[PDB]
Amino acid sequence: PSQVRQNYHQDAEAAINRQINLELYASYVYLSMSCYFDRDDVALKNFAKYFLHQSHEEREHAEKLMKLQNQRGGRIFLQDIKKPDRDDWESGLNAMECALHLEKSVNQSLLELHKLATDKNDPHLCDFIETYYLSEQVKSIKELGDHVTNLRKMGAPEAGMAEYLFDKHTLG
Amino acid sequence: PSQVRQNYHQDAEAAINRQINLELYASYVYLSMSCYFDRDDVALKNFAKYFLHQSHEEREHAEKLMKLQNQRGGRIFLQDIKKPDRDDWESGLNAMECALHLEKSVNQSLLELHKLATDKNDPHLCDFIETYYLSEQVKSIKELGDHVTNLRKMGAPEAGMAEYLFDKHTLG
Amino acid sequence: PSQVRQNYHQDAEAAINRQINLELYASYVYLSMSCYFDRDDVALKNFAKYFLHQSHEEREHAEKLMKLQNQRGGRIFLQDIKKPDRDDWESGLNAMECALHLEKSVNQSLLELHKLATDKNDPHLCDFIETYYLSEQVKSIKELGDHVTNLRKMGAPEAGMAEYLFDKHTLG
Amino acid sequence: PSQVRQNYHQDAEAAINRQINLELYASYVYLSMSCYFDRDDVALKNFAKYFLHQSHEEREHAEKLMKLQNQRGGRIFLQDIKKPDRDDWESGLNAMECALHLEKSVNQSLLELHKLATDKNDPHLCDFIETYYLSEQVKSIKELGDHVTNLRKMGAPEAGMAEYLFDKHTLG
């Protein structure tokens, strides 16, 4: 194989490629959400900024995984980026709920990847996942849960003022 | 004609004079709106500031058209500036809706002017309209649509807090 | 339709959505190229940096088109991002040649979009395409052609020193 | 034993002492390489600087392991530092290849040490190895593989200009 490859199982390499695809898909979903909130009949600028930032950070995570794959001697094999499940996210509260579900699914994939790396005795891959992905995922999940709780308390989406004031005070 | 006139049809010159009058009328309408929100029984200072700024920008657009007319060798022929349709604009939401209708009417006049300039093969006039008027009009229309959407969501004008909080957070 | 929509044909809206997908695809292709040059058996850091920058600029172009679609009252409908045609780009010279072909294909799509917007008498869309996309595309095509010419002159990829010195002096 | 010793198996302590000796040996090998490139009939100053820096960093790694051994209550037992396998490294390309083999052997020893620490349930030792040694080793291996690939492409050592230009552009 590659001259630098050492203690890098093919199963881990394939799982890393799958995780790259999942991160790109999550970036795409966040881009779709941000474009939803930019609509003239939605018009929540701070929601759009929040989700655009989320999309960019997801792209950064995917590129970091790509760098990890090249650095361990693996070979990156890209796949199609699937379109998001919907183009109409219907509310700020529903978009935050969908983002929470998406981040938890990404976390579950990362935990399966860590279990695979632990089984193959790849401590570098395990430490990489723990240091750069698991803590960030847990923080993101907690932040989204806080957002969903606050939006639910204020009466969103039935209360019209709730999403507006949340956009101004929390995301502003 | 004028020593500088070249590829400047009389139809374009008359249409430019009409557009000057329309821009002055829009400035006058915005001034009337700003004076409405300065009333002691309305008292929305940021609404008044927003519409006064809009009035000043329409005046600047009219003066730029005047400079264009003199620069191409045309002769400016002024007309009466008609009074606005009403002095009581009844709410922030109704004023934003009327502003949206007004900006769209100005956009329609600009599009007709661009079609006339295209038909007469006046690329300088076409490029001038595209560079200084059409993009600004589209941005203004999108901004007003966003304002109307947000005010409608918050329950304006039936919800008393909606126009106040919109004045503080969006226009403040 | 949307409260802000004016002089925006449905054909133009669909073509804009297609162009968004094409820009995202080109960003993906550039990401694949950048990951190719980061491999340990390729190891051309400035090539990888160049193509990563190209990917990021393509993503920015796609987001600008998304903003344009929302600003004119259109509705963004996303599609799957197809995977690039290959994961092994085989040389710096072949990657630059493929990038040249890709940029020319994007230019051809932009020219078809401009012809459609001209036929529908949408001067705002025409001016938007000319101001933000056509000049950048022409500059990018000229730059890539210059790169391909220089790499061909130096004997790439048969001459081993050529791609290395081009990486150091032109892309460095 | 020592008043501070807790969850520190004797096997781990002996393995740490062996790793200290291996790091000192690698520092010595890098010093020999740097002295080879300082010769008047070799005269590659940036190669010598690169390998001298590698020697110093290896010495730093050994001293950090010594601090870890004293901090966990272990006792450092030093051994003879074996001389390098050769004094004539014959080329820049051969020296980089030997450095790659050496770093991979050090990585293999570190992975065996991590497996031993995992088996003894010493999470502090495991985390120490992952945080300070495994990532640095992987980065060093990738860097050396990149260097070897680039030198091989440019025609080293048969092409006389290759090692000179690599010394100037990559190591300079």
Swiss-Prot record, chains A, B, C, D:
What is the recorded name of this protein?
Ferritin heavy chain
Enumerate the residues binding Fe cation 1. E23, E58, H61
Subunit-structure text: Oligomer of 24 subunits. There are two types of subunits: L (light) chain and H (heavy) chain. The major chain can be light or heavy, depending on the species and tissue type. The functional molecule forms a roughly spherical shell with a diameter of 12 nm and contains a central cavity into which the insoluble mineral iron core is deposited. Interacts with NCOA4; NCOA4 promotes targeting of the iron-binding ferritin complex to autolysosomes following starvation or iron depletion.
One GO term in the molecular function aspect is: iron ion binding
Pfam families found in the cross-reference section: Ferritin (PF00210)
Q: Say which species the protein is native to.
A: Mus musculus
Q: Which reaction does it catalyse?
A: 4 Fe(2+) + O2 + 4 H(+) = 4 Fe(3+) + 2 H2O
Keywords in UniProt for this one? Acetylation, Cytoplasm, Cytoplasmic vesicle, Iron, Iron storage, Lysosome, Metal-binding, Oxidoreductase
Localisation? Cytoplasm; Cytoplasmic vesicle, Autophagosome; Autolysosome
Q: Which residues form the signal peptide?
A: none
Task: Give the record's GO biological process terms.
Answer: immune response; intracellular iron ion homeostasis; iron ion transport; negative regulation of cell population proliferation; negative regulation of ferroptosis
The entry's family comment says: Belongs to the ferritin family.
Provide the top EC class: oxidoreductase
Give the EC number(s) under which this enzyme is classified.
1.16.3.1
Function per UniProt? Stores iron in a soluble, non-toxic, readily available form. Important for iron homeostasis. Has ferroxidase activity. Iron is taken up in the ferrous form and deposited as ferric hydroxides after oxidation. Also plays a role in delivery of iron to cells. Mediates iron uptake in capsule cells of the developing kidney. Degraded to release iron upon autophagy activation by nutrient starvation.
**Lineage: superkingdom:** Eukaryota
Q: Does the keyword Cell membrane apply?
A: no
Knockout phenotype, as recorded, reads: Homozygous mutant embryos die in utero between 3.5 and 9.5 dpc. Heterozygous animals are healthy and fertile and do not present any apparent abnormalities. They show slightly elevated tissue light chain ferritin content and 7- to 10-fold more light chain ferritin in the serum than normal mice, but their serum iron remains unchanged.
Assign the protein's first listed, main location to one coarse class. Answer: cytoplasm
